[PDB]
């Protein structure tokens, strides 16, 4: 999801009703500025059948 020929999906929000973009304070910004990279993990997935 999506299919093979389309661009990926974008996530930037954290509410239930999407406002309030995700923040980062000053030390994490300066660590991100110095060439580091963050890692993304998954934990669980809920769905239907």
């Amino acid at each position: 999801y999506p299919k093979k020929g389309l661009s990926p999906l974008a996530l930037n929000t954290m509410d239930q009703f999407s406002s309030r973009l995700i923040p980062i304070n000053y030390d994490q910004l300066k660590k991100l500025d110095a060439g580091k990279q963050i890692k993304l993990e998954t934990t669980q997935v809920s769905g239907n059948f």
């Binding site: 300066k30 660590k31 500025d33 110095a34 060439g35 580091k36």
Partner: protein, 93 residues
């Protein structure tokens, strides 16, 4: 006397990706009292080259924010690299 504050290091050329590859530099320089002490390692900083507001961002070595008490002078110094596994050397005088 002229003391050095920092090193606006490796200006943006037409062919450089290696400045996006390093994260740490390691300094050895001569302070004003008890010269040629070993200093520690830090992370690099990104600033505008020569302070121009219309100019790209290069590396920078903020030499004031290290384990010193005093200044630096125009004498013997070495500037080494932390590539991601090994060590390497880049600047000498």
């Amino acid at each position: 006397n002229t003391y050095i504050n920092g090193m606006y290091f490796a200006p943006t050329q037409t062919n450089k990706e290696a400045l996006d590859y390093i994260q740490k530099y390691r300094v050895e320089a001569t302070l004003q009292y008890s010269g040629f002490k070993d200093i520690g390692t830090k992370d690099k900083e990104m600033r505008n080259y020569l302070g121009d507001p219309n100019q790209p961002k290069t590396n920078y070595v903020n030499l004031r924010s290290y384990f010193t008490g005093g200044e630096n002078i125009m004498t013997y110094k070495k500037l080494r690299i932390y590539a991601i596994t090994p060590d390497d050397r880049e600047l000498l005088v």
